[PDB]
């Protein structure tokens, strides 16, 4: 998963309503119909300026614009393509409230103006849905009235949810049938949830529930694939349809630190159990199922970025993992300027690969049984060792071995309680700081034998221990996860026969043939000749290593003069080895007349 750099679509006009950045997203509406995975067009209603349709690719461009008076606010906007009585057409339905005195529902038909109509709506329009199949426009009002009109804005049906001050209404389709659910605040942080089915009445109420403890004033809401997501006080509350029961609560620690009032937060869905969260100029791609931060990006060139809408992928059915989202970005400066920007989002594969090790949520051995049978203080040690003077080997070993009750200079099965990595790494630092040059404590020998030797200190360990051959020999035998690159360099650099044998065995045991070969191609052409010349001067492992050496250098680079020695050398062992095999197996492996001399 990844987040792309935002690219500008258009620059928002300098209108007083749009000057309030915190409410700016409220004054920009995104049409649901034109904005999805496959559409290259976006219809956007900018309150007080216009409703404009843009093409995104190959370059952002303005395709259409319908002006609106500066005193009017776009409360709901939708656009959809279809067939109308049959000609292909585009139907745009938008609501404009002017000073709360009047609300205007407007429908425009364009040929792909064919027609335009305007009526007075009883209350502020919250959402608009366009049904091109039945040539219907469905408008939900703040007073709870759902009115179904034709394209001529003739009222065909009216339904009352019996509740006013409706705050949220979202449309969704399941199994080919259209559904809408609505939220209406009640007193004492109580909320009415209703689910309505669109088919004497084309609207059928399926569910009506009151959910308690549901506050709005500091809550950001979005819905996706039957799940309603509520972000509040840094916690994401997830509700399941068709009865809107709280399934799980996700605590997001990166928001609890935000001071209440100054930080701008936007929250939209992008895929199955994946959502987009922006905190001022930082954008987060989140995975709610696994509770992992898939990706993070900071827009250093803008003060804030507010998500408006996001094209959501149904990754369960879609092989596509790339989508887009639209938001408002505000620039830094004395005269801030707001612009509409599009971000390309790679959601990923929706697998546990994408979430591993990316959690946004931030030991000691304990007995198995709390309480007639067989038995087949890290900081205190740290401070005692740190309190020692420099280059005091005897005291350093004495404190370590005595305090930890270690009996052997090498790690043993009994030394497990010391296995805590935090304690060890500190002891490594103390050994390095306290002791430099040619004398190290015996404690290092014990830690070297430890299986959990820190990976951070593996690098250069051979170089540090080069001066003492005994420690260098120990590092080869048992020091865990030593980087292969260093051993290959030491293999061709060391002239001691015993170390050469020990290194090769360690490489073959702990690294694959493929892993060895690639790094081993990097080795200089002269160094390999020195090693090969060493060979010409347990061994099968070395010969296998030589077989690898012949592999990496390649037939071109081999110089015929030197090979003359090698075949004569290699043939010298084949005859020997065949001889030895023959020896190996062997150790595993009457007359009618006779003359005889009788003894009497």
């Amino acid at each position: 998963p990844s987040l792309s750099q935002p690219f500008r679509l258009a620059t928002l006009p300098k209108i007083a309503s749009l000057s309030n950045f915190s409410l700016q997203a409220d004054y920009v509406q995104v049409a649901d119909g034109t904005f999805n995975e496959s559409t290259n067009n976006i219809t956007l209603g900018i309150s007080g300026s216009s409703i404009s349709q843009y093409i995104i690719n190959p370059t952002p461009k303005l395709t259409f614009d319908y002006p609106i008076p500066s005193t009017n606010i776009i409360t709901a906007c939708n656009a959809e393509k279809g067939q109308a009585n049959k000609r292909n057409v585009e139907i745009w339905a938008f609501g404009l409230m002017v000073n709360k005195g009047n609300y205007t529902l407007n429908v425009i038909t364009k040929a792909l103006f064919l027609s335009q109509y305007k009526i007075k709506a009883k209350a502020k329009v919250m959402s608009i849905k366009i049904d091109t199949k039945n040539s219907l426009v469905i408008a939900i009002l703040q007073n709870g009235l759902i009115e179904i009109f034709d394209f001529k804005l003739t009222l065909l049906h009216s339904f009352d949810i019996s509740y006013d001050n409706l705050k949220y209404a979202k449309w969704f389709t399941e199994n080919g049938t259209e559904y809408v659910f609505v939220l209406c605040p009640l007193q004492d942080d109580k909320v009415c949830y209703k689910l309505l089915e669109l088919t004497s009445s084309p609207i059928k109420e399926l569910s009506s529930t009151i959910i308690e403890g549901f506050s709005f004033e500091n809550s950001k809401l979005c819905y996706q694939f039957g799940k309603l997501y509520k972000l509040n006080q840094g916690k994401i509350y997830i509700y399941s349809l068709p009865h809107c029961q709280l399934q799980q609560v996700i605590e997001f620690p990166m928001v609890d630190k935000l001071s209440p009032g100054d930080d701008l937060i936007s929250f939209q869905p992008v895929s199955v159990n994946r959502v987009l969260l922006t905190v001022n100029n930082v954008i987060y791609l989140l995975d709610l199922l696994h509770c992992s931060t898939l990706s993070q990006r900071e827009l250093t060139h803008v003060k804030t970025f507010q998500l408006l809408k996001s094209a959501v992928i149904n990754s369960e059915k879609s092989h596509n993992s790339k989508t887009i989202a639209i938001g408002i970005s505000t620039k830094n400066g004395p005269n801030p300027t707001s612009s509409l920007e599009i971000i390309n989002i790679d959601v990923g594969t929706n697998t546990l690969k994408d979430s591993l090790g990316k959690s946004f949520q931030v030991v000691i051995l304990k007995p198995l049984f709390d309480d007639r049978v067989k038995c087949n203080h890290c900081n205190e040690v740290i401070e005692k060792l740190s309190a020692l003077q420099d280059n005091d080997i005897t005291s350093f070993d004495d404190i370590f071995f005595k305090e930890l009750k270690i009996k052997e200079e090498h790690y043993t099965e009994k030394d497990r309680y010391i296995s805590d990595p935090g304690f060890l790494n500190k002891v490594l630092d103390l050994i390095f700081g306290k002791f430099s040059g040619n004398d190290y404590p015996k404690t290092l020998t014990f830690l070297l034998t430890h299986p959990l030797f820190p990976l951070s200190r593996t690098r250069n360990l051979l170089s540090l221990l080069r001066d003492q051959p005994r420690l260098f020999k120990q590092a080869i035998v048992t020091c865990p996860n030593l980087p292969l690159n260093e051993l290959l360099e030491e293999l061709f650099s060391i002239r001691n026969r015993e170390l050469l044998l020990d290194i090769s065995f360690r490489i073959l045991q702990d690294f694959t043939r493929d892993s060895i070969k690639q790094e081993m191609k990097k080795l200089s052409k002269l160094d390999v000749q020195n090693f090969i010349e060493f060979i010409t001067s347990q061994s099968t492992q070395l010969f296998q290593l030589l077989s690898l050496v012949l592999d990496s250098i390649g037939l071109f680079s081999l110089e015929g003069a030197l090979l003359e020695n090698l075949t004569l050398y290699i043939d010298k062992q084949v005859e020997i080895a065949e001889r030895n095999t023959e020896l190996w197996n062997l150790i595993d492996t009457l007359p009618t007349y006779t003359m005889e001399y009788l003894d009497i």
Binding site: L365, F369, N376
Partner: protein, 757 residues
């Protein structure tokens, strides 16, 4: 929340007395001959012979008296002694209990207690209202006493009076009529036959008279008697010999007659009621019916196991009762009782309990006597040394794994036991075996092994698993070459894929791969793929060299195929490998030696921390849920969150798991549910003031991430294995072959009279 409860049964109960021979069987057939009664180690089963189903089951736990009492049943007598569907059970200690079958078990049976002074009850028998009991008192030879038993209605007590005594009884047997006793003593040896309820028969004679001079010249096996049989009339006595020769002796004049067909030691000899017929059985897995009139023989070959006992059961010899041993399983003695028909020699009732194969022998199980000392048998001398060595191994040694592999079938929830070269399919809902199928080649039922042939090792089924769908079986087998050959050290590794349509009961071999992963490389681990990947028709196989191989079933080829490979040719060997797959199937955790590795499935290599180092070698890797991974190393266990890459909890296993279990057994001991949590098992050794054979186990229910213990329960015996049934409950197998579960008017009188008529 959770609770433990025994579910299945156990082994059939046998009269496990060394001296007693020809009377091991304790199961009795009803007087009406419509059902067969068999006592098990923990229950009593009444099987209707006609329908061949368990019509009634009596569990000791259900009744308080049997719960406290159960000591083993030494005999069953039809009806009640004190006084039409009653039976009297006699146990070794002396409890005489009258219970009922074909009905409801009464919670107050007529419990009684015979008085015995340092005497262990061995046998009882009756002819007509007269009851005699045989008892044991203690040169490694037990002595026997014959007492008379009568019930006095005044005191309601079983009085015992002395009748006879014999010392250093070696072998003993009772006639079919239950009225004659033949036995052997060291007073080399002498045979004596005595009438029980009368003084009519009283004869004794040294064994050497019967033994031939050639038998004296040859080895002890020729002079070693293995079985005794006595005719009802007492005229004929049959002697078996380890060499395989049968000698019928006429008691009137001590004249001998030699019948020689058995190549190995004869185990079971039994006379017919008339005496003209002799049933013989031994290691050959074949029954021989000897016509004494013409010295002819009829054969019933290819039995499931070697014959321990033979007997004719019927007023006219209608049924034969047989005991089979299944000697291939050296770890455990698997007894199966078979009721055949003289008419057509067909099985009217085969009964046997679950047949697990433990890694090592348990308790005091000893291999049966044979002509030679072999892997599956003991020679004459080898018996005492083997018994002492077994005891001292269970006492002093530390390796006490006794861990058996078991499998659960998702579609049917049947239990699969990978028996040696075969699978036993057993239903624990019904507590009855459903099938026994050979999955391999080899000498398994072609012929009966005898003498050096017995040293041959049949193929070993080491791993047996099901796919998530359950329509496929994956099996891994090892072929052992015959000894004393150049190719005596090249073990062959074989993998097999089988399919079975749900209606049928027999699995069909679909594919065979010879020498997977290469030659002489074992498949240490196998893991079926999750439902996400290839809709549950793929699998992974992992070696001791770290090589991983992913097979899949491809429709176009119509069989399994090798899809992905990763062959890192590591130079070191370790049998401690574990493998786990995510539910989504995206990632694979492979733990080799001390090092755990995370692999991307798509590229089948390292993800791009992928290496986690462990203090010791990893035995088990399992993910309780998609978030958490529980990894057990030889010293401890640790819960790791992949999301954080940090350890949440760590539990110290070394005090209990140090060298008691071989690597890889922790896999089959540790179990995990995919919804609620996992479970940890620890068996431990009990003692009061040096080690004792008895064992005690504890089961701990753990939540995901191991934060808390949902429950801590204890069982009084070594729980060999646990698996997680696909239901919430877990099923556990106990070395007594016990499967339990841990989990959350004139007209009315007229009608009565007519019904009686």
């Amino acid at each position: 929340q959770y609770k433990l409860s025994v579910v299945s049964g156990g082994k059939p109960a046998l009269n496990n007395l060394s001296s007693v021979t020809g009377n091991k069987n304790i199961a009795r057939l009803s007087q009406d001959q419509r059902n067969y009664i068999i006592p098990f180690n923990n229950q009593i089963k009444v099987y209707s012979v006609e329908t061949r189903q368990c019509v009634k089951t009596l569990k000791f736990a259900n009744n308080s008296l049997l719960s406290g009492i159960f000591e083993s049943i030494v005999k069953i007598l039809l009806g009640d002694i004190t006084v039409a569907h009653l039976i009297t059970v006699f146990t070794n200690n002396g409890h005489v209990i009258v219970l009922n079958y074909k009905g409801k078990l009464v919670e107050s049976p007529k419990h009684f207690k015979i008085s015995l002074a340092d005497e262990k009850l061995a046998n009882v028998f009756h002819s007509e209202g007269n009851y005699r009991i045989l008892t044991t008192f203690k040169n490694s030879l037990q002595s026997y006493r014959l007492y008379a038993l009568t019930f006095d209605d005044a005191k309601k007590q079983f009085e015992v009076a002395h009748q006879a005594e014999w010392h250093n009884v070696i072998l003993s047997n009772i006639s079919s009529n239950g009225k004659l006793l033949a036995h052997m003593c060291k007073d080399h040896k002498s045979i004596s036959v005595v009438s029980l309820f009368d003084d009519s028969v009283n004869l004794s004679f040294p064994l050497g008279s019967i033994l031939s001079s050639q038998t004296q010249s040859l080895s002890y096996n020729t002079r070693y008697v293995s079985s005794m049989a006595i005719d009802n009339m007492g005229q004929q006595l049959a002697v078996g010999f380890a060499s395989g020769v049968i000698s019928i002796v006429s008691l009137a004049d001590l004249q001998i007659r030699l019948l020689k067909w058995h190549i190995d030691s004869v185990l079971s000899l039994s006379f017919s009621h008339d005496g003209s017929y002799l049933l013989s059985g031994g290691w050959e897995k074949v029954m021989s019916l000897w016509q004494l009139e013409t010295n002819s023989q009829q054969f019933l070959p290819r039995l499931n196991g070697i014959i321990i006992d033979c007997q004719v059961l019927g007023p006219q010899g209608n049924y034969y009762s047989l005991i089979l041993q299944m000697t291939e399983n050296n770890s455990n003695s698997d007894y199966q009782f078979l009721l055949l028909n003289a008419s057509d020699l067909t099985s009217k009732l085969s009964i046997n309990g679950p047949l697990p194969v433990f890694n090592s022998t348990i308790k005091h199980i000893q291999q049966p006597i044979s002509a030679m000392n072999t892997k599956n048998s003991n020679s004459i001398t080898s018996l005492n040394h083997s018994k002492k060595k077994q005891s001292r191994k269970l006492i002093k040694s530390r390796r006490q794994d006794f861990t058996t592999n078991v499998e659960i079938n998702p579609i049917n929830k049947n239990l699969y036991f990978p028996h040696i070269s075969a699978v036993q399919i057993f239903d624990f809902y019904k507590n009855e075996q459903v099938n026994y199928q050979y999955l391999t080649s080899g000498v398994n039922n072609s012929m009966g092994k005898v003498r050096f042939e017995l040293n041959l090792q049949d193929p070993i089924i080491t791993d047996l698993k099901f796919t998530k769908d359950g329509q496929w079986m994956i099996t891994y087998e090892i072929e052992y070459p015959p000894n004393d050959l150049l190719s005596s050290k090249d073990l062959t590794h074989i993998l097999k894929f089988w399919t079975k349509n749900d209606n049928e009961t027999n699995w069909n071999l679909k594919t065979k791969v010879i020498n997977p992963h290469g030659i002489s490389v074992p498949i240490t681990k196998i893991l079926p793929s999750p439902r996400s990947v290839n809709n549950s028709q793929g699998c992974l196989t992992a070696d001791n060299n770290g090589g991983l191989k992913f097979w899949s079933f491809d429709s176009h080829e119509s069989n399994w195929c090798l899809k992905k490979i990763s062959l890192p040719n590591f130079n070191h060997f370790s049998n401690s490998v574990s493998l786990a797959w995510s539910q989504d199937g995206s990632l694979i955790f492979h733990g080799f030696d001390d090092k755990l590795q995370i692999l991307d499935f798509d590229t089948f290599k390292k993800f791009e921390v992928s290496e986690f180092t462990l203090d010791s070698e990893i035995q088990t890797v399992k993910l309780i849920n998609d978030t958490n991974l529980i990894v057990a190393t030889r010293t401890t266990l640790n819960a790791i969150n992949l999301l954080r890459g940090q350890v949440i909890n760590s539990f110290d296993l070394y005090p209990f798991v140090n060298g008691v279990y071989k690597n890889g057994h922790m896999d089959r001991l540790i179990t995990c549910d995919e919804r609620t949590g996992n479970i940890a098992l620890v068996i431990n050794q009990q003692l009061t003031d040096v080690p004792t054979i008895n064992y005690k186990s504890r089961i701990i229910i753990f939540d995901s991430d191991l934060s808390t213990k949902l429950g801590n329960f204890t069982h009084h015996e070594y729980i060999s294995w646990i698996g997680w049934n696909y239901d919430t409950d877990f099923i556990f197998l106990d070395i007594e072959s016990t499967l339990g579960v841990v989990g959350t008017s004139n007209s009315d009188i007229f009608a009565e009279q007519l019904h009686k008529l």
